[PDB]
Design an enzyme around this catalytic site. Structure first.
Site, PDB file in Angstrom:
ATOM      1  N   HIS A  61      29.244  38.475  18.058  1.00 34.55           N
ATOM      2  CA  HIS A  61      29.429  39.830  18.635  1.00 34.55           C
ATOM      3  C   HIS A  61      28.140  40.673  18.659  1.00 34.55           C
ATOM      4  CE1 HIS A  61      33.679  38.981  18.610  1.00 34.55           C
ATOM      5  NE2 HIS A  61      33.608  38.682  17.326  1.00 34.55           N
ATOM      6  N   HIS A  91      23.065  46.354  12.364  1.00 31.88           N
ATOM      7  CA  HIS A  91      23.174  45.603  13.598  1.00 31.88           C
ATOM      8  C   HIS A  91      22.985  46.573  14.752  1.00 31.88           C
ATOM      9  CE1 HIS A  91      27.235  47.250  12.991  1.00 31.88           C
ATOM     10  NE2 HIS A  91      27.136  47.453  14.290  1.00 31.88           N
ATOM     11  N   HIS A  93      23.964  47.507  19.102  1.00 27.48           N
ATOM     12  CA  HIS A  93      24.724  47.341  20.335  1.00 27.48           C
ATOM     13  C   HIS A  93      23.744  47.629  21.468  1.00 27.48           C
ATOM     14  CE1 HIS A  93      28.599  47.555  18.119  1.00 27.48           C
ATOM     15  NE2 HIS A  93      27.878  48.301  17.302  1.00 27.48           N
ATOM     16  N   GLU A 103      26.725  53.229  22.102  1.00 26.70           N
ATOM     17  CA  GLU A 103      28.153  53.456  22.006  1.00 26.70           C
ATOM     18  C   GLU A 103      28.449  54.954  22.095  1.00 26.70           C
ATOM     19  OE1 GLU A 103      29.453  50.839  18.580  1.00 26.70           O
ATOM     20  OE2 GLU A 103      30.290  49.891  20.370  1.00 26.70           O
ATOM     21  N   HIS A 116      23.211  50.650  14.066  1.00 29.29           N
ATOM     22  CA  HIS A 116      24.167  51.047  13.039  1.00 29.29           C
ATOM     23  C   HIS A 116      23.777  50.476  11.702  1.00 29.29           C
ATOM     24  CE1 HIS A 116      27.384  51.529  16.384  1.00 29.29           C
ATOM     25  NE2 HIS A 116      26.586  52.574  16.279  1.00 29.29           N
ATOM     26  N   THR A 195      33.787  50.539  15.463  1.00 29.32           N
ATOM     27  CA  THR A 195      33.812  50.489  16.918  1.00 29.32           C
ATOM     28  C   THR A 195      34.137  49.099  17.422  1.00 29.32           C
ATOM     29  OG1 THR A 195      31.446  50.036  17.145  1.00 29.32           O
ATOM     30  CG2 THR A 195      32.125  52.434  17.119  1.00 29.32           C
TER      31      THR A 195
HETATM   32  C1  LIG Z   1      32.223  42.182  14.167  1.00 30.38           C
HETATM   33  C2  LIG Z   1      32.960  43.061  13.192  1.00 30.38           C
HETATM   34  N1  LIG Z   1      32.265  44.220  12.684  1.00 30.38           N
HETATM   35  C3  LIG Z   1      33.106  45.197  12.005  1.00 30.38           C
HETATM   36  C4  LIG Z   1      33.626  44.624  10.697  1.00 30.38           C
HETATM   37  C5  LIG Z   1      32.560  44.423   9.663  1.00 30.38           C
HETATM   38  C6  LIG Z   1      33.152  43.679   8.502  1.00 30.38           C
HETATM   39  S1  LIG Z   1      31.982  46.054   9.176  1.00 30.38           S
HETATM   40  O1  LIG Z   1      30.796  45.980   8.356  1.00 30.38           O
HETATM   41  O2  LIG Z   1      33.022  46.830   8.558  1.00 30.38           O
HETATM   42  C7  LIG Z   1      31.657  46.856  10.677  1.00 30.38           C
HETATM   43  S2  LIG Z   1      30.739  48.191  10.889  1.00 30.38           S
HETATM   44  C8  LIG Z   1      31.081  48.252  12.557  1.00 30.38           C
HETATM   45  S3  LIG Z   1      30.385  49.571  13.499  1.00 30.38           S
HETATM   46  N2  LIG Z   1      30.126  49.017  15.002  1.00 30.38           N
HETATM   47  O3  LIG Z   1      31.389  50.624  13.633  1.00 30.38           O
HETATM   48  O4  LIG Z   1      29.202  49.998  12.760  1.00 30.38           O
HETATM   49  C9  LIG Z   1      31.941  47.172  13.031  1.00 30.38           C
HETATM   50  C10 LIG Z   1      32.228  46.421  11.823  1.00 30.38           C
HETATM   51 ZN   LIG Z   2      28.122  48.895  15.347  1.00 28.02          ZN
END
Ligand SMILES: CCN[C@H]1C[C@H](C)S(=O)(=O)c2sc(S(N)(=O)=O)cc21
Ligand SMILES: [Zn+2]
Length: 257
Positions: A61, A91, A93, A103, A116, A195
């Site tokens: 992802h 990470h 986006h 986002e 993020h 998100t």
């Molecule tokens: C691919 C899943 N990612 C999810 C689950 C992970 C376990 S996490 O660290 O809770 C996390 S943080 C974000 S974001 N985009 O809101 O910062 C998405 C995610």
């Molecule tokens: Zn994110």
């Protein structure tokens, strides 16, 4: 299952994750004329000098850089937060073109990408318990615009070739995330959600006003990654962003006039 294509993308997520249509979903558009300056907000305290990065991973992802969060080494405090939040991963986006990818948006403006930095509230003992709580996570969001290269991003860029496809990972030690911050720490903040699935409503969002600049060559390398695993048909990892969700009954607060 879920992803960002026509048949499994954000418009479909609610079928497996009904919280998709919940009351505090992210991201949102930040209307700068409607955000309220709140003088009771403290400045952010980013203490990243002892950060220990371990690994970079393509998870199908995005790519995550992971940190040792077994002790209070890299922490976020202050701002709207009560207590200490540990850095666990970061990470990005990003988009297929320079005018999309973030986002969050600002007055409907999209940036080329969004970083993020994900932190969890230590009072809950581990990360898994934290995501189940309304104040469990704090994500620091930073916009990227295309212009001059960011030297501190280049180490990330150079390793991307080794994690091209889903499930691949590489050792990634001694990376200093301070190289990714803008000069100013002025921010907007609102209560929101992850998100991506599972879309849990456990996040205090802290979004920095000042974007960082990356070069076109840097963001081009993000776009050469793959959603798919090795030996599967190639699908470029681009446009892994969720569109803005309704604000509903929330107010966005600003730390600055
Ligand atoms: C691919 C899943 N990612 C999810 C689950 C992970 C376990 S996490 O660290 O809770 C996390 S943080 C974000 S974001 N985009 O809101 O910062 C998405 C995610
Ligand atoms: Zn994110």
């Amino acid at each position: 299952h879920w992803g960002y294509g026509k048949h499994n993308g954000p418009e479909h997520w609610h079928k497996d994750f009904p919280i998709a249509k919940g009351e505090r979903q992210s991201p949102v558009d930040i209307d700068t004329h409607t955000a309220k300056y709140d003088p009771s907000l403290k400045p952010l305290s980013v203490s990243y000098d002892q950060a220990t990065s371990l690994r970079i991973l393509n998870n199908g992802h995005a790519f995550n850089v992971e940190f040792d969060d077994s002790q209070d080494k890299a922490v976020l405090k202050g701002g709207p937060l009560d207590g200490t939040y540990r850095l666990i991963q970061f990470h990005f986006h990003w988009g297929s073109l320079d005018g999309q990818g973030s986002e969050h948006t600002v007055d409907k403006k999209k940036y080329a990408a969004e970083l993020h930095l994900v932190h969890w509230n230590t009072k809950y003992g581990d990360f898994g318990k934290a995501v189940q709580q309304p104040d469990g996570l704090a994500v620091l969001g930073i916009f990227l615009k295309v212009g001059s290269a960011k030297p501190g991003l280049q180490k990330v860029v150079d390793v991307l070739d080794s994690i091209k496809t889903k499930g691949k990972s590489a050792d990634f030690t001694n990376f200093d995330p301070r190289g990714l911050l803008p000069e100013s720490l002025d921010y907007w903040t609102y209560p929101g959600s992850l998100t991506t699935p599972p879309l849990l409503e456990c996040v205090t969002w802290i979004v920095l006003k000042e974007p960082i600049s990356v070069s076109s060559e840097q963001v081009l390398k993000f776009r050469k990654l793959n959603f798919n695993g090795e030996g599967e048909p190639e699908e470029l990892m681009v446009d892994n962003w969720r569109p803005a969700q309704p604000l509903k009954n929330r107010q966005i607060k600003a730390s600055f006039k």
